[PDB]
Design an enzyme around this catalytic site. Structure first.
Site, mmCIF file in Angstrom:
data_model
loop_
_atom_site.group_PDB
_atom_site.id
_atom_site.type_symbol
_atom_site.label_atom_id
_atom_site.label_comp_id
_atom_site.label_asym_id
_atom_site.label_seq_id
_atom_site.Cartn_x
_atom_site.Cartn_y
_atom_site.Cartn_z
ATOM 1 C CG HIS A 61 60.902 47.290 56.872
ATOM 2 N ND1 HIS A 61 60.081 48.349 57.158
ATOM 3 C CD2 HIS A 61 61.380 47.468 55.620
ATOM 4 C CE1 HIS A 61 60.040 49.131 56.051
ATOM 5 N NE2 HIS A 61 60.844 48.640 55.140
ATOM 6 C CG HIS A 91 62.467 45.139 66.024
ATOM 7 N ND1 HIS A 91 62.396 46.338 66.696
ATOM 8 C CD2 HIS A 91 63.724 45.106 65.501
ATOM 9 C CE1 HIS A 91 63.582 46.973 66.581
ATOM 10 N NE2 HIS A 91 64.402 46.243 65.845
ATOM 11 C CG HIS A 93 67.430 43.184 63.177
ATOM 12 N ND1 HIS A 93 67.164 44.093 62.163
ATOM 13 C CD2 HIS A 93 67.232 43.844 64.307
ATOM 14 C CE1 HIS A 93 66.749 45.253 62.724
ATOM 15 N NE2 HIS A 93 66.790 45.120 64.041
ATOM 16 C CD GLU A 103 70.291 45.245 62.753
ATOM 17 O OE1 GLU A 103 69.940 45.899 63.729
ATOM 18 O OE2 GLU A 103 69.948 45.518 61.555
ATOM 19 C CG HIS A 116 67.325 45.465 68.247
ATOM 20 N ND1 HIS A 116 67.584 45.899 66.969
ATOM 21 C CD2 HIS A 116 68.483 44.939 68.720
ATOM 22 C CE1 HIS A 116 68.849 45.575 66.681
ATOM 23 N NE2 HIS A 116 69.454 45.053 67.713
ATOM 24 C CB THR A 195 70.176 49.019 63.174
ATOM 25 O OG1 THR A 195 68.976 48.254 63.280
ATOM 26 C CG2 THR A 195 70.941 49.069 64.478
HETATM 27 ZN ZN LIG Z 1 66.335 46.479 65.480
#
Ligand SMILES: [Zn+2]
Length: 257
Positions: A61, A91, A93, A103, A116, A195
């Site tokens: 992911h 991590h 996004h 996000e 994050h 999230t």
């Molecule tokens: Zn995250």
């Protein structure tokens, strides 16, 4: 299983995770004119001097940079928080192109990526217990824009070739997450959720106002990762972001004016 595609992405998650349509989902759009400056909000205390990174993992992911959280070595306190939260992992996004990836959004602006740093409340003893509580996690969110390189990111970038596919990991010791921070710790805060599945409503979000700058080359290396496992059809790891969710009965507070 869940992912980011048409067939298994955010619009599908509610079938296996009904809390997806809950009362405190994340991310959200931050309306800068509606956010209330709250003079009661304290400065954030980010204490990462003794952080012990251990390993980096491609989980199918994103990639997680994991820390030793067996003691209070890297903790977040102050800000909107009561008590002490220990860093477990960070991590990102990110998008397929620089115009999407974050996000949270700011007045509907999407950043190229979002970092994050995930921390759990030590009063619950372990992460698995913390995620069952409404004050269990504090997640520090940092926007990334594309421009100059972030020197402190390059060690992350240059290990990614070794964890291309899902389930690969590599030793990742002595990484200093202080090098990922912006200058200012001005923030917005609101109560929300993880999230990604399981989407648990256990997060105090702390989203920094000031983005960090990374280079186009750095982000391009994120986009060479794979969602798939070794030898499987190649699916580039891009667009691993959930869009903004309804704010519902929530107040976003600013530490600044
Ligand atoms: Zn995250």
């Amino acid at each position: 299983h869940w992912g980011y595609g048409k067939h298994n992405g955010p619009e599908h998650w509610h079938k296996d995770f009904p809390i997806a349509k809950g009362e405190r989902q994340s991310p959200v759009d931050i309306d800068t004119h509606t956010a209330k400056y709250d003079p009661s909000l304290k400065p954030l205390s980010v204490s990462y001097d003794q952080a012990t990174s251990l390993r980096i993992l491609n989980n199918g992911h994103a990639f997680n940079v994991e820390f030793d959280d067996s003691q209070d070595k890297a903790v977040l306190k102050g800000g909107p928080l009561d008590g002490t939260y220990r860093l477990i992992q960070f991590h990102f996004h990110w998008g397929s192109l620089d115009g999407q990836g974050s996000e949270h959004t700011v007045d509907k602006k999407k950043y190229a990526a979002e970092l994050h740093l995930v921390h759990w409340n030590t009063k619950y003893g372990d992460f698995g217990k913390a995620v069952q509580q409404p004050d269990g996690l504090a997640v520090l969110g940092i926007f990334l824009k594309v421009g100059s390189a972030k020197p402190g990111l390059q060690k992350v970038v240059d290990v990614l070739d070794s964890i291309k596919t899902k389930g690969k990991s590599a030793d990742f010791t002595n990484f200093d997450p202080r090098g990922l921070l912006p200058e200012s710790l001005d923030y917005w805060t609101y109560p929300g959720s993880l999230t990604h599945p399981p989407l648990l409503e256990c997060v105090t979000w702390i989203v920094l106002k000031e983005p960090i700058s990374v280079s186009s080359e750095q982000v391009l290396k994120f986009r060479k990762l794979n969602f798939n496992g070794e030898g499987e059809p190649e699916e580039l790891m891009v667009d691993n972001w959930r869009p903004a969710q309804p704010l519902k009965n929530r107040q976003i507070k600013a530490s600044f004016k």
